[PDB]
């Protein structure tokens, strides 16, 4: 009766597929404390390590749930109100893949669990010692300070993660983070429209 | 590495291409109130509005710049349309292209980078489906469309077409648009090579 169809190109049309919030659950395992202690120590130590390694290398892990067919990234939330992508800091002659890797096993890791990392969905430039991030090398800027690199990663039906006693685990709505870098950050508050090309599939 | 990993794009100067003049195209509605009936007798017909756009790409002493067309002064939009019903984006876009920018006297479309959604027959658009929207209006769908080394364009009379570099419509969604003003964001993933 029917007859065979190709495939689309994964370029064309990227299909992830999605799972209920419910399936995801958290334990508790020993705090993990923010290397800098102030916005003002934070830019000294990036300045400090780029004269000695370069360009700091970040990069970020984004967890997508669904509730009722909305989908909800998942952030990590520091006392009440600094929300964060699970992620972090590479080391100098670390692999991006591996090095989130790593930092997704250490920030989110149970203790007795592979994690799926096939997307980039963005980078991100910081030009000075500054807060200021650009999704782009703005014009005459030849050393940028920092590079940071978000990744899409898939889950598993069901996931049991263990999670520092300082953090919190939390889902945001896209529309809680549409146009809202006031609670979440230019980065986290532009990831609906980096998450738009997704072809989400609500199981 | 993986098409999923790194999307390797080759970028050639503006000085690349050449503009050429044809007959002016005029908008299929005459002002914002007819446009938003027509959207509203069209869903009654045929349904959900599905639009395609092209994002066209060059660089100017290795800055990239997004192709616009300008109606005057304020007014600027992608290259792009509605699709017909039952046609494939993809060749739809393609249609749209040629339409306006092709002459009387070869698009290159392998990545989609964006959806946008309407929900009511008005202005606002979202990157996403709002809660409890079953029914949304208008689906848009961008694409990057890749250029040939050297191009020449028809443009109609009515239009410019501009070259507007990234850091022009970052955070700019007064002078944009929600949509164009991202545009900075959905190509960030691209690894663009300048020729």
């Known amino acids: 009766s029917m007859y065979i169809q190709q ?7 990227r299909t992830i597929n999605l799972y209920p919030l419910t399936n995801y659950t958290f334990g508790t395992k020993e705090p993990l404390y923010e290397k ?3 916005v003002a120590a934070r830019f000294q130590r990036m300045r400090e390590e780029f004269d000695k ?7 970020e892990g984004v967890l997508i749930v669904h509730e009722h067919r909305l989908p909800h990234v998942l952030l990590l939330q520091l006392g009440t109100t600094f929300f964060k992508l699970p992620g ?6 670390e692999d991006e893949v591996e090095g989130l890797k790593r930092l997704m096993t250490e920030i989110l890791g149970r203790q007795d669990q592979d994690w799926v990392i096939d997307d ?12 200021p991030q650009y999704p782009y090398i ?31 685990l939390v889902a945001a709505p896209l529309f809680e983070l549409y146009d809202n870098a006031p609670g979440y950050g230019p980065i986290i508050s532009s990831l609906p429209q980096l998450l738009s090309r997704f ?3 609500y199981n």
């Open 7 to 13: 495939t689309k190109p994964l370029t064309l049309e």
């Open 36 to 38: 800098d202690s102030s």
């Open 53 to 59: 390694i370069g360009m700091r290398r970040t990069v």
């Open 88 to 93: 972090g800091e590479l080391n100098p002659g």
């Open 120 to 131: 980039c969905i963005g980078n991100w430039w910081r030009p000075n010692f500054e807060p």
């Open 138 to 168: 703005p014009a005459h800027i030849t050393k940028p300070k920092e590079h940071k690199k978000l990744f899409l990663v898939q889950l598993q039906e069901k996931a049991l993660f263990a999670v520092p006693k300082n953090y919190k």
């Open 199 to 201: 072809n989400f599939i």
